[PDB]
Design a protein around this ligand. Structure first.
Ligand SMILES: [O-][Cl+3]([O-])([O-])[O-]
Ligand SMILES: [O-][Cl+3]([O-])([O-])[O-]
Ligand SMILES: [O-][Cl+3]([O-])([O-])[O-]
Ligand SMILES: [O-][Cl+3]([O-])([O-])[O-]
Ligand SMILES: [O-][Cl+3]([O-])([O-])[O-]
Ligand SMILES: [Cl-]
Ligand code: NI
Length: 129
């Protein structure tokens, strides 16, 4: 599914990401914009041969199993394909683990490079949250 900006913000909130580990909703929307363009079916092969999956481009090296990423852990305990569903529950649950891992949202290099420090609230403006 390709989510609308406000639609994804509502979903992410319903799933308890607003201010999760201190990161307001707009940081989540922003990272998903730049990670998947809001597309639950986004897959991207990384240089190490792992793949990123979903709305928040969770990577098979540490977080989910895709069966083709040597050395990988499946820390969120799920098939990576479960991160491409139209229902973001599994992606959100897994994101909560990733952002809790130590580096907060810097885990998403696109968040660090394109969202961090910016007016992320712009990402949920006009939304009936
Ligand atoms: O639809 Cl945006 O790419 O302006 O969230
Ligand atoms: O990817 Cl780790 O669990 O070392 O942070
Ligand atoms: O859209 Cl930024 O990549 O300026 O947050
Ligand atoms: O993450 Cl915010 O509610 O500043 O957009
Ligand atoms: O906390 Cl609200 O459902 O009243 O906007
Ligand atoms: Cl392996
Ligand atoms: Ni409200």
């Amino acid at each position: 599914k390709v989510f609308g900006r406000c639609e994804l913000a509502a979903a992410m909130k319903r799933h308890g990401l607003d201010n999760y580990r201190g990161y307001s909703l707009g940081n989540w929307v922003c990272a998903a914009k730049f990670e998947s363009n809001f597309n639950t079916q986004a897959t991207n092969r990384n240089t190490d041969g792992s793949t990123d999956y979903g709305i928040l481009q969770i990577n098979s090296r540490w977080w989910c199993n895709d069966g083709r990423t040597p050395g990988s852990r499946n820390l969120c305990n799920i098939p990576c394909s479960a991160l491409l569903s139209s229902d973001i529950t599994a992606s959100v649950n897994c994101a909560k683990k990733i952002v809790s891992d130590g580096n907060g949202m810097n885990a998403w290099v696109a968040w660090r490079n394109r969202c961090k420090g910016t007016d992320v609230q712009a990402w949920i403006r006009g939304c009936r949250l």
